[PDB]
Copies of this chain bind each other. A is one copy, B any other.
Amino acid sequence: DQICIGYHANNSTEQVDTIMEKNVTVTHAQDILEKKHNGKLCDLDGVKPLILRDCSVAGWLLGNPMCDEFINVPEWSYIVEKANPVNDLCYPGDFNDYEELKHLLSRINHFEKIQIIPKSSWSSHEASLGVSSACPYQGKSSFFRNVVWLIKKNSTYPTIKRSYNNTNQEDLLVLWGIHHPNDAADQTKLYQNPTTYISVGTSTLNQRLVPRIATRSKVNGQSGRMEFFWTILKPNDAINFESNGNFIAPEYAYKIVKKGDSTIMKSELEYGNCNTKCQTPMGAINSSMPFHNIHPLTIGECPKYVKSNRLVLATGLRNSP
C-alpha cells in the first residue's frame, strides 16, 4: 500500500519561453497578443470615417472640382487619405502651413460649410472668369469651388475693401489665396496694375502678401502659382481684406462643429462596409487581448501595440513527455 504526490499532465502542445529555456511545453497557456485584423476600413462605433478617395485634405478644403464627393460631408470619426492622392491643388502652388492645419483637423469631427462673401457680391470686378485648364470640371475649365478668382472689370481693378464679422458661435476656418503670374504681361492681362498686394487683418493677424514673379516649369500646364493661406477667425472677430489684384477671395468658409478626438490615417485602402471599436491603417481590430501587433497608429478602444511576434504566458505547469 502506497500513496503518492503528483501533478497534472495533459496532451497540451502549447509552448512558452523563459529566460533560461525556450519552448517549454505547458499544460495551459494564455496568449495575450492579437495577431489578426479584418483588413478593411470600417465605421468606428457606428460613425463613418471621411474617406477622401483620390482627394487630399487640401483638395477637399479648397474644393478642387474633382473633389465633388466631399462638397458637404457629415460628421466623421477619423479621416483617411492616400499616400499620394492625385486630386490635390489642381492649379499648382503651395498651401501655407498645411501640416499645422492637418494637425488641427485631428481635433475636428465636423465642419459645416457656410458662405461668407457671396460670389455675386462683386460689383467692380469680374468673378465668372477665374478658371483654368489645370482644374477641369466635366470637360470645361473650372476652379476651386470655395475661393473666387477675381479679375478686372472692363480693364480696371479698383481696390477691394471687404470685411467679414463672425456672428457664428463656432470658430471659423477662413481660406484665401494669392496668384503669382510668370511675367509682367500676365500681371496686366488679369489685373492691369503692375505692383499689387493683399492685406489681411483680424484681431491677431497682420498680413500683407505680395506677388512673386518668376519664370518656372509648367506643373499641370500652368507656370502661374496659387498659394493658399488660412486663419481661424475667433467668434465676434472681423476679418479685413484689402487688395488691388492677385487676390483669391473666400466665397465659403467652414464652421467648426462638434470637434472631437480624431486622426488622419494614411492608407491605400478603400471603405469596407463594417463596424468596429478599434481601427488601424491596415484593418480593424476585434479582440480582448491586452496587446496587438498590427500597426502603431490606432483610434478607439484599442489593445496596446507591441512589436512582438509572440506573447504567451504560462498558466499551467510544465507538461511531461
The yes or no answer to A255 lying at the interface (CB within 8 A) is no
In this complex, the member of A93, A161, A240 whose beta carbon has the largest number of chain B beta carbons within 10 angstroms is A240
In this complex, the member of A201, A225, A242 whose beta carbon has the largest number of chain B beta carbons within 10 angstroms is A201
Which parts of A186-242 form the interface with B (CB within 8 Å)? 199-208, 212-217, 219, 225, 227, 237-238, 240, 242
Assess the B212–A208 pair: CB atoms within 8 A.
yes
Cβ of A261: which chain B residues have Cβ within 8 Å of it?
none
Report the nearest B residue to A212, measured CB to CB: B208
- Of the residues B180, B200, B216, B217, contact of A214 by C-beta under 8 Å: B200
- Docked Cα-Cα span, A213 to B163, in Å, equals 15
- Size of the chain A interface, CB-CB below 8 angstroms: 28
**Binary CB contact string for chain A from 84 to 106 against chain B (1 if under 8 A, 0 otherwise):** 00000000011000000000000
Assess the B214–A237 pair: CB atoms within 8 A.
no
Assess the A240–B216 pair: CB atoms within 8 A.
yes
Assess the B203–A216 pair: CB atoms within 8 A.
yes
- Docked Cα-Cα span, A219 to B237, in Å, equals 10
Output the least CB separation between A281 and chain B (Å).
Answer: 25
- Of the residues B94, B205, B207, B208, contact of A206 by C-beta under 8 Å: B94
Assess the B199–A206 pair: CB atoms within 8 A.
no
Cβ of A200: which chain B residues have Cβ within 8 Å of it?
214
- Docked Cα-Cα span, A201 to B215, in Å, equals 6
Report the nearest B residue to A218, measured CB to CB: B203
A217 and B199 in contact, given A207-B212, A212-B207, A212-B208 (Cβ under 8 angstroms): no
Output the least CB separation between A232 and chain B (Å).
Answer: 14
Assess the B217–A242 pair: CB atoms within 8 A.
no
- Of the residues B93, B225, B242, contact of A215 by C-beta under 8 Å: B242
Cβ of A240: which chain B residues have Cβ within 8 Å of it?
214-217
Output the least CB separation between A199 and chain B (Å).
Answer: 4
Assess the A206–B180 pair: CB atoms within 8 A.
yes
Besides A93-B206, A207-B212, A214-B242, 11 more A-B contacts (Cβ < 8 Å) are: A180-B206, A199-B214, A200-B214, A201-B216, A201-B217, A206-B214, A208-B212, A208-B213, A214-B240, A215-B242, A217-B238
Instruction: State the A residues within 8 Å of B (CB).
Output: 93-94, 161, 163, 180, 199-208, 212-217, 219, 225, 227, 237-238, 240, 242
Pairs across A and B, CB under 8 Å, 17 listed:
A93-B206, A94-B206, A199-B214, A201-B216, A201-B217, A202-B217, A204-B219, A206-B212, A206-B225, A206-B227, A207-B214, A208-B214, A214-B242, A215-B240, A215-B242, A216-B240, A217-B240
